[PDB]
Amino acid sequence: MIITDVEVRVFRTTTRRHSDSAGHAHPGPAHQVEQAMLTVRTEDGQEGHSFTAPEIVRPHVIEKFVKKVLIGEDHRDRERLWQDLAHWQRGSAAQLTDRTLAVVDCALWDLAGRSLGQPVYKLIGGYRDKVLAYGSIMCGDELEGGLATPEDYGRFAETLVKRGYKGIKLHTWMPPVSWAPDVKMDLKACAAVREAVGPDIRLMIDAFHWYSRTDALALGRGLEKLGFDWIEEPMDEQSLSSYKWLSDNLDIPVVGPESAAGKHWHRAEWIKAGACDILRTGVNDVGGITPALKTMHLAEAFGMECEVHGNTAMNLHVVAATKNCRWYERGLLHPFLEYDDGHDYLKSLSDPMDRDGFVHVPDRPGLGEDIDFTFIDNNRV
Amino acid sequence: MIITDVEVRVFRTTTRRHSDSAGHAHPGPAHQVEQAMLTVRTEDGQEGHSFTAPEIVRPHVIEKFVKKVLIGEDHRDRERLWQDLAHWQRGSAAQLTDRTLAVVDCALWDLAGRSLGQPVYKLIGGYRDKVLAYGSIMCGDELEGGLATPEDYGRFAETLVKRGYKGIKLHTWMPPVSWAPDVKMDLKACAAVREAVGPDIRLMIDAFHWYSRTDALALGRGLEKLGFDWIEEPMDEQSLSSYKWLSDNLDIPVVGPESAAGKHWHRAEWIKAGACDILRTGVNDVGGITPALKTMHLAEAFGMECEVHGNTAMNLHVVAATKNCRWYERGLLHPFLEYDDGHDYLKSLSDPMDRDGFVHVPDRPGLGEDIDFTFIDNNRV
Ligand SMILES: O=C(NO)[C@@H](O)[C@H](O)[C@@H](O)C(=O)[O-]
Ligand SMILES: O=C(NO)[C@@H](O)[C@H](O)[C@@H](O)C(=O)[O-]
Ligand SMILES: [Cl-]
Ligand SMILES: [Cl-]
Ligand SMILES: [Cl-]
Ligand SMILES: [Cl-]
Ligand SMILES: [Cl-]
Ligand SMILES: [Cl-]
Ligand SMILES: [Cl-]
Ligand SMILES: [Cl-]
Ligand SMILES: [Cl-]
Ligand SMILES: [Cl-]
Ligand SMILES: [Mg+2]
Ligand SMILES: [Mg+2]
Ligand SMILES: [Mg+2]
Ligand SMILES: [Mg+2]
Ligand SMILES: [Mg+2]
Ligand SMILES: [Mg+2]
């Protein structure tokens, strides 16, 4: 159907999540944060929606790039439209980002699903209606009883096992935590968690993202003693060669790249060079559901797993449509916060999890985000 | 000295340069364009300045990132400050770009030079006070007598040779030129230029940036028959493997990567994999003078040249401080425009060129941009 409108609505959500100056999430005081909803509408009035930070869909980007590509086009030509946006990034003075591509692609998928009364993963071609989640723990902090000590991680891990998680991923301490980073502290946290949960829970760590080769090597060696299942992004992913070196040295599987640019193209280079043992993708990291699927297929053709970064519907649907991914990433989690409480702007969870640790994909059309339109309207900026 | 202020001044410049929807420059009607000047000031009142597009230094980026890193710090700690910004990019929701790092780093270098009464390339450590420039021709257009036909390129090339350029680089036709791209037309333009200038002028081409492997191969083979000195960015640089393949296949030197992310780190990967025969860097492409110098040094250690993308003082000073770069890129040029007329907001050229094709670096302190502060003040947005 012909796309007639692209609209952004900015509203305030009430949350206890804060992000530090380096972008890491932490629990803090309840406060209002601006959140944006992108809507694509067709001639018959059907809409698709997706959520992102206001800057990613600010008027500069919407007017200069997004509307020019989308308006007047058949909404179903997702490949053509994605490629059109992709070929405009180079000349965009660094303003047309993969994040912008992602929210646009997601809204187009939601539009197609809502139009047809079909969940996105079913339209793609379903693999699984439920999937194991790992509990993805927030970055370390200096909050007493929070994630300040190695024992704090151990205690929280016990809680996650009780909840039903069959896998747990630590994010350890990073600047601006005053004393961070420290390999020995990271390893103490990992050891506390292994001691707490025993050998039959799968454990992963996603550490400070800029350790030197020598520090990441020491971290990896320590993890092998604790039977961890993977090490994630312990070094600057801009150095492919460092990851090749680390993977060759470590027995423990290295997963990546999460944050590196270049979408599926650059991820092929990680396979080619042997820079990782497990690939990584994510809707936000590679510019949408469409390229995330490509990354999943790329990995599958090499007989590799590709673990999907990020919670929310958009990532869950990629995981549900593909086989070669062990988990959905559920979080980030913190003992001070109740993840299962959801968001004020959604009427129900996009990723409810049973007591056995399986997330069940909602049977709602599109991305299945149960949007509280009335709340958004009552809280506009 | 302690940094006390970071300020952005947005002003209108009058220019005939336009950018199409894919970001390519073309000559068009005279119009006003918003330009931004970033200023860093220290406790004693000394200032450094650099220019960029308004979005790159908009309040979001200045307040959330730049001020937090710079304010209260010793202006001379350019390495520490650059690394601080670099380590904040990952968590910036794609808003802290290499372009933002570049303008900040440039302003800091300008500040150090102005404070000491020294040109930046002299502070770095001078290699050459003058350098050969190639005439870098604008992307093709559909303007009669402009760059619409192969013969138009040939005629313009004759003019460039008369001006004194010893080297000429074509940018050929790209979308949204109605019929673009077409390898055979690109090759006709290259042939017209070679016929016009003879065998003793150095010729380069920078083509449509997203040709398939098969098209870029055909382009490269055609260039070999015309004795061209390099082929630049004919394929999506997100595919390192495509560049390894193309370089292995072509006799003509392949230069890159220009636009790929990852700064000097990712450029090391291009050397390691043999993806190019000549490296490429640029102040805007790798996030500043500081990392551009790193890329130059990286290339030199492999006995490679590293050609520096972009005109203006910031790139000229990198070229003047290093040996392993054949040219300064002077342009973009078009028969309808007079490059030597300069900009309304600068009192004189940053890159004047003699009749023998050498650009002479001004002996003015800092980046040596002869800023018309009065004009800027009279034309504020
Ligand atoms: O890595 C992640 N998930 O796996 C994201 O959770 C984050 O960006 C996290 O690593 C961080 O804030 O450093
Ligand atoms: O490649 C360049 N210089 O070499 C820059 O001039 C440009 O981005 C140009 O290629 C373009 O607009 O495609
Ligand atoms: Cl339809
Ligand atoms: Cl249609
Ligand atoms: Cl499963
Ligand atoms: Cl739940
Ligand atoms: Cl509602
Ligand atoms: Cl000083
Ligand atoms: Cl000082
Ligand atoms: Cl802003
Ligand atoms: Cl020279
Ligand atoms: Cl001149
Ligand atoms: Mg991660
Ligand atoms: Mg290994
Ligand atoms: Mg709790
Ligand atoms: Mg170029
Ligand atoms: Mg070759
Ligand atoms: Mg003329």
DSSP B75-102: TT-HHHHHHHHHHHHTTTTT-S-HHHHH
CB atoms within 10 A of CB B251: 10
Residues 6+ apart with CB under 8 A from A187: A219, A222, A223, A226
First to last CA, chain B: 31
Helix B98-116 and helix B78-89, axial crossing angle in degrees, nearest 10: 170
* CB contact at 8 A, A243 and A276: yes
Given a contact cutoff of 8 angstroms between Cβ atoms, the answer to whether B278 and B232 are in contact is no
Residues in chain A, how many? 381
Token digits of residue B92: 């910036």
Single out the residue of A48, A45, A39 nearest to residue A366, CA to CA: A48
Angle separating helix axes A183-197 and A150-163, nearest 10 degrees: 40
Atom 11 (ligand 1) nearest CA: A24
B360 three-class SS: strand
Q: In 10 A of CB A130, how many CB atoms?
A: 15
Per the CB < 8 A criterion, the answer to whether A245 and A272 are in contact is no
Say whether the peptide bond before residue A181 is cis (omega within 30 degrees of 0).
yes
Report chain A residues whose CB lies below 8 A from the CB of B21. 68, 88
Cβ–ligand 1 contact at A171 (below 6 Å): yes
Rounded CA separation A137/B224 (Å): 56
CB atoms within 10 A of CB A111: 26
What one-character-per-residue DSSP string does B13-58 give? EEEEEEE-TTS-EEEEEEEEEEEEEEEEEETTS-EEEEEE-GGGG-
State the CB neighbour count (10 A cutoff) for residue B325: 26
- List Cβ neighbours of B198 (8 Å cut-off, separation of 6 or more): none
- Residue B111 and residue B43 in contact, taking contact as beta carbons nearer than 8 Å: no
Smallest CA–CA separation between B98 and chain A, in Å? 8
Ligand 1 in reach of A139 Cβ (< 6 A): yes
Residues of A in contact with B272 (CB under 8 A): 241
Is residue A254 within 8 A of residue A278, CB to CB? The reply is yes
Cβ atoms of residues B54 and B10 within 8 Å = yes
One-letter amino acid at B111 equals L
Q: B55 and A93: CB-CB below 8 Å? A: yes
Q: What is the largest CA-CA distance in chain B?
A: 60
Does the bond joining A352 to the residue before it have cis omega, within 30 degrees of 0? no
Dist. CA B172–CA B180, nearest whole Å: 9
Per-state percent for chain B, helix, strand, coil, to nearest 5: 40, 25, 40
d(CA B333, CA B170): 10
Nearby residues of B37 by Cβ (< 8 Å), 6 or more positions away: B8, B9, B10, B11, B49, B50, B51, B371, B376
Q: Token pair of A374, please?
A: 């009335």
Domains of chain A, start order: 1-117 (3.30.390.10), 118-381 (3.20.20.120)
Other Cβ atoms less than 10 A from the Cβ of A28: the count is 15
Radius of gyration of chain B (CA): 20
Identify which of B57, B43, B64, B44 has the alpha carbon closest to the alpha carbon of residue B7.
Answer: B57
**Torsion region of B367: left, alpha or beta (phi above 0 gives left; psi -120 to 50 gives alpha):** alpha
A25-42 and B306-308 as β-strands: parallel, antiparallel, unpaired?
unpaired
Decide if A343 contacts A13 (C-beta within 8 A). Answer: yes
Please give the number of the atom of ligand 1 that sits closest to the Cα of A22.
12
DSSP labels for B200-245? TSEEEEE--TT--HHHHHHHHHHHHTTT-SEEE--S-TT-HHHHHH
Looking at residue B148, the DSSP 8-state letter turns out to be: S
Q: Which residues of A touch B36 (CB under 8 A)?
A: none
B250 annotated to bind ligand: yes
Distance (Å) from CA B1 to ligand 8 centroid: 4
Contact by Cβ (8 Å): B219, B207: yes
Task: For residues B107 and B290, give the distance between their C-alpha atoms in angstroms, rounded to a whole number.
Answer: 11
The answer to whether A283 and A102 have CB atoms below 8 angstroms apart is yes
Please tell me the number of Cα atoms within 13 Å of B149 on its side-chain side. 5
Query: Which is nearest to B257 in space by CA: B55, B98, B108, B138?
Result: B98
Comparing CB atoms, the residue among A24, A93, A260 nearest residue B91 is: A24
Distance, in Å, from the CA atom of A163 to the CA atom of A156, rounded to the nearest integer, reads 11
B297 alpha carbon – ligand 4 mean position (Å): 53
Torsion angles phi and psi, residue B231, rounded to 5? -110, 135
- Report helix angle B313-320 to B98-116, nearest 10: 70
- Core vs surface per residue B272-303: b (16+ CB within 10 A) or e: ebebbbbbbbbbbbbbbbbbbbbbbebbbeee
- What does the CA dihedral B341, B49, B263, B244 come to, rounded to 10 degrees? 0
Contacts of B303 (CB under 8 A, 6+ apart): none
Q: Show residues of chain A in contact with B268, CB under 8 Å.
A: 239, 241
3-state secondary structure string across chain A: CEEEEEEEEEEEEEEEEEECCCCCEEEEEEEEEEEEEEEEEECCCCEEEEEECHHHHCHHHHHHHHHHHHCCCECCCHHHHHHHHHHHHCCCCCCCCHHHHHHHHHHHHHHHHHHHCCEHHHHHCCCCCEEEEEEEECCCCCCCCCCCCHHHHHHHHHHHHHHCCCEEEEECCCCCCCCCCCHHHHHHHHHHHHHHHCCCCEEEEECCCCCCHHHHHHHHHHHHHCCCCEEECCCCCCCHHHHHHHHHHCCCCEEECCCCCCHHHHHHHHHHHCCCCEEEECHHHHCCHHHHHHHHHHHHHCCCCEEECCCCHHHHHHHHCCCCCCCEEEEEECCCCCHHHCCCCECCCCCCECCCCEEECCCCCECCCCECHHHHHHCEC
Give resolution in angstroms: 1.6
Shortest CA distance from A273: residue in chain B: B273
Atom of ligand 1 nearest to the CA of A331: 6
d(CA A288, CA A105): 5
Q: How far apart are CA B17 and CA B28, in angstroms?
A: 6
Q: What distance in Å separates the CA atoms of residue B319 and residue B317, rounded to the nearest whole number?
A: 5
> Distance between the two ends of chain A, CA-based, in angstroms?
31
The structure tokens 């380096």 sit at A22
Q: Environment class of residue A23 by beta-carbon count within 10 Å: exposed (0-12), middle (13-18) or buried (19+)?
A: middle
Q: Report yes or no: A203 and A236 within 8 Å, Cβ to Cβ.
A: no
CB of residue B330 inside a 6 A radius of ligand 2: no
Cα→Cα distances B184→B154, B181, B187, B219, B222, Å = 16, 9, 5, 8, 9
**B29 burial via Cβ count (<10 Å: 0-12, 13-18, 19+):** exposed
The residues that bridge with A371 in the sheet, in sequence order, are: A346
CB contact under 8 A, A261 and B262: yes
| Bridge pairing between strands B230-232 and B278-281 | unpaired
| Method underlying the structure | X-ray
Distance A77 CA to ligand 4 centre (A): 9
Q: Give yes or no for a contact between B100 and B62, defined as CB atoms under 8 angstroms apart.
A: no
**Residue B60 distance to chain A (closest CA, Å):** 8
Overall size of chain B counted in residues: 381
Q: A149: Cβ–Cβ under 8 A, 6 or more apart, which residues?
A: none
Distance B53 CA to ligand 18 centre (A): 27
CA distance A24 to A22: 6
Using a CB-CB cut-off of 8 Å, the residues of chain A touching B55 are 60, 93, 95
The answer to whether the beta carbons of residues B254 and B211 sit under 8 Å apart is no
Strand order in the sheet with B3-19: B3-19, B25-42, B47-52
Q: How far apart are CA A362 and CA A351, in angstroms?
A: 7
Q: Which residues surround ligand 18, an ion (CB under 5 A)?
A: B 335
- Short-list B47, B137, B101, CA closest to B365: B47
The residue type of A199 is P
Q: Please name the amino acid found at residue A236.
A: D
- The candidate with the shortest Cα–Cα distance to B211, out of B249, B251, B172, is B172
Judged on CB neighbours under 10 Å (0-12, 13-18, 19+), B143 is middle
Residues A208, A234: contact at Cβ < 8 Å?
Answer: yes
Contact call for residues A68 and A30 (beta carbons, < 8 A): no
Neighbour tally for B77: CB within 10 Å = 14
SS3 B359: strand
Token pair of A351, please?
């990723």
Q: What is the DSSP string of B242-311?
A: HHHHHHHH-SSPEEE-SS-SSHHHHHHHHHHHT--SEEEE-HHHHTSHHHHHHHHHHHHHTT--EEEP--
Would you say the CB of residue A206 lies under 6 angstroms from ligand 1?
yes
Q: Torsions phi, psi of A285, nearest 5?
A: -80, -25
